[PDB]
Design a protein around this nucleic acid. Structure first.
Length: 227
DNA sequence: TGCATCCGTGAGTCGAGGGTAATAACCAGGGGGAGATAAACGAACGCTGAACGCTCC
């Protein structure tokens, strides 16, 4: 009877491991907009803006009602409550949201770091990153979905950057350098990944190659942005 | 006709500042406004999907 929800990838819902038919992208947008609010009520006004932004359909208010009605047929009675003219998600177990479950472990990683148990921090953070099932909010349209896509992609990088710092402190240089090459290729303006790559490369005895990374980074900022 | 009496009016200029008293007392009735609970409609939601199209195998 454990309800599970997925927001760190395609918008999915599970019951006892079985996938529920989460419906249209706009129905997925409605679910995501409530899930990422962590039980706070979303007014009908905020829900119209979340789904369509500045260009709502002329019958948008009826559409929200139609989408909400279909979710009630797929979700169990009482999770999606209607209060104050809006909708909220209630009665979720702890850790039912993959984002919420990852947040406790990520907060614990800060606690794990502060107690000095870097090994536990490495494993707990590792479990968090494996919860990312591809592109966040895949196939979900709308400005609110776009903003949350932006927020969680950026937030993912912060957890990777924090985990990678521990790798350099524990001597795992050779494994980390290879993955770091992909990150700087994927995030070319992200100087922090090249900083970690430069140090790891040098500690692998490739001192001459580290300065080549430096020459490339200054070039990219001067040629493309002038900074 | 004269004398005596009383009543009304006016009497500078600008400055400074706030409060005053006292004796049968009651049922009895009863009106009249000031605050407390169910009925008329239409508007949010609600599932009802049904009824249309929008992409996909």
């Amino acid at each position: 009877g454990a309800l599970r929800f997925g927001v760190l990838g395609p918008v999915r819902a599970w019951r006892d491991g079985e996938t529920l038919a989460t419906g249209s992208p706009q129905q997925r947008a409605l679910l995501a907009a409530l899930l990422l609010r962590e039980g706070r009520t979303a007014t009908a006004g905020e829900l119209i803006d979340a789904l369509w932004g500045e260009e709502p359909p002329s019958q948008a208010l009826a559409a929200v009602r139609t989408y909400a009605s279909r979710l009630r047929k797929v979700l169990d009675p009482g999770v999606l409550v209607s209060e104050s003219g809006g909708y909220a998600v209630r009665g979720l177990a702890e850790g039912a949201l993959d984002l919420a479950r990852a947040q406790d472990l990520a907060s614990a990683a800060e606690k794990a770091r502060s107690a000095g148990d870097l090994c536990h921090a490495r494993d707990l953070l590792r479990r968090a990153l494996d919860l990312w099932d591809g592109e966040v909010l895949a196939g979900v349209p709308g400005p609110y979905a776009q903003t949350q896509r932006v927020r969680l992609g950026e937030w993912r990088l912060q957890l990777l950057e924090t985990r990678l710092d521990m790798d350099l402190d524990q001597g795992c240089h050779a494994e980390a350098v290879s993955e770091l090459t992909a990150l700087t290729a994927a995030h070319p303006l992200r100087e922090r990944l090249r900083e970690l790559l430069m140090l790891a490369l040098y500690r692998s005895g490739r001192q001459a190659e580290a300065l080549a990374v430096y020459a490339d980074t200054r070039r990219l900022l001067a040629d493309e942005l002038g900074v």
